[PDB]
Design a protein around this ligand. Structure first.
Ligand SMILES: [Br-]
Ligand SMILES: [Br-]
Length: 124
């Protein structure tokens, strides 16, 4: 249940735009190709079988899909932990990216991370 899921990771998970998924917290601004400070996790509140894949993509109005590294993970006990997701493509200092999350249930579900993320060559 959502209460149970929150109680397993208190103070760590945020809403996505889907009622069915939560996520861990990403930086608001990060350096291109730098390892993330908190490994990204997508958390299913609904029934999602172990092994169900989850893929993320980043983009905005001038870059439909910015390069990522290690942008797929598999669900285990309702959590898909990305071991080393990296944001390679840069948004620049003036724009940010939306991160879309696709969970490959049958059929797939799309969610969006709750904040934009800026990616630059130097980072913050
Ligand atoms: Br790119
Ligand atoms: Br840049």
């Amino acid at each position: 249940s959502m209460v149970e899921v929150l109680a397993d990771h208190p103070g760590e998970l945020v809403r996505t735009d889907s009622p069915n998924f939560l996520s861990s917290v990403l930086p608001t601004h990060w350096r291109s190709n730098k390892t993330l400070p908190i490994a990204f996790k997508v958390v299913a509140l609904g029934d999602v079988p172990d092994g169900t894949l989850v893929t993320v993509m980043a983009g905005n109005d001038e870059n439909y899909s910015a390069e990522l590294r290690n942008a797929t993970a598999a669900m285990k006990n309702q959590v898909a932990r990305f071991n080393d997701l990296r944001f390679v493509g840069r948004s620049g200092r003036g724009k940010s990216f939306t991160l879309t999350i696709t969970v490959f249930t049958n059929p797939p579900q799309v969610a969006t991370y709750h904040r934009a993320i800026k990616i630059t060559v130097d980072g913050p």
